[PDB]
């Protein structure tokens, strides 16, 4: 583990401030950049000193997410039980857009959900997918530019790589409790080990 992150230098000092703007609060509280109707060229109103491009600062400093991808495995029951997690994402991150990847049966569950933007059908149970369909889904996920991706499917090396190629800042997944999930946590920002080989047993 030292050999992975060389020059670690511990964690951040308690007195670090991370600047002034885009430092505290939530996503809906940011006062800058604001509209400048008096500008003849349509340029916004920016704070003194700060660079013009400020929307990228919240992701680095405050860890804001605007588009989230929840790849929920299972049918109607699991996708229904994932509703409090979706509401939690909406409450914690105001203004976020949540997209769901699930099976054909689980996609119909999100008809009665007020928080999901897109619900997409993808055969997650197939361990050997069609190369064209797999590539199309991966490119779609790459082109949505998800800030964070969560996976309730038990992720091996292949699912970890699929989440890795999503270009998401946070890659969070459930992993296999057995030895076959070795190296999956290297490609994921956060890993969860359930108490059994079946997550729906809970």
């Amino acid at each position: 583990n030292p050999w992975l992150d060389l020059f670690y230098d511990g964690e951040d000092e308690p007195e670090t401030e991370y600047g002034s703007m885009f430092s505290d609060g939530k996503q809906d509280e940011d006062p800058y950049p604001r509209d400048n109707p008096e500008n003849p060229y349509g340029f916004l109103k920016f704070p003194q000193g700060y660079a013009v491009e400020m929307a990228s600062l919240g992701s680095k400093v405050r860890g804001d997410v605007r588009r989230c991808c929840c790849v929920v495995s299972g049918g109607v029951y699991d996708n229904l039980l994932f509703f409090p997690a979706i509401q939690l994402i909406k409450d914690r991150y105001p203004g976020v857009q949540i997209d769901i990847i699930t099976s054909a049966r689980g996609k119909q569950t999100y008809e009665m959900n007020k928080n999901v933007r897109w619900a997409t059908v993808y055969d997650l149970d197939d361990n050997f997918p069609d190369p064209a369909e797999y590539t199309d889904m991966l490119g779609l996920l790459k082109n949505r530019y998800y800030d964070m991706v969560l996976s309730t499917k038990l992720a091996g090396l292949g699912h970890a790589a699929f989440l890795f190629m999503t270009t998401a800042r946070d890659r969070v997944s459930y992993v296999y409790p057995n030895v076959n999930a070795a190296g999956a946590g290297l490609l994921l920002s956060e890993t969860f080990t359930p108490d059994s080989m079946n997550l729906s047993e809970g």
């Binding site: 007020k114 928080n115 897109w118």
Partner: protein
């Protein structure tokens, strides 16, 4: 002249009439030219004509735009709009 009679023992004789004929290149160019003018005339006339389906409410009312992917996009749009309408209703209440 261009007629040949062959007799075969034990067989009926055959009279063959032959005429080596071919269209001139000028005639072929005339065919091409007339087909080009017919194509131009038809393009003009049948573009000026009315289109029974693509101008109808059955096509434009559903969201059609001549684009091959409007059906799937319209479907995903109406599901997203239903979810957004539920969100609006929960906000108002």
């Amino acid at each position: 002249m261009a007629v040949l009679v062959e007799h075969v023992e034990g067989q009926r004789d055959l009279i063959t009439h032959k005429s080596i004929w071919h269209l001139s290149d000028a005639a072929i160019k005339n065919v091409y030219l007339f087909y080009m003018m017919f194509t131009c005339w038809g393009c003009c006339v049948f573009g000026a004509a009315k289109d029974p389906y693509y101008d109808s409410e059955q096509y434009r009312g559903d969201g059609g735009d001549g684009t091959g992917h409007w059906v799937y996009e319209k479907q995903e749009d109406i599901e997203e709009a239903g979810r957004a309408a539920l969100w609006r209703e929960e906000l108002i209440e």
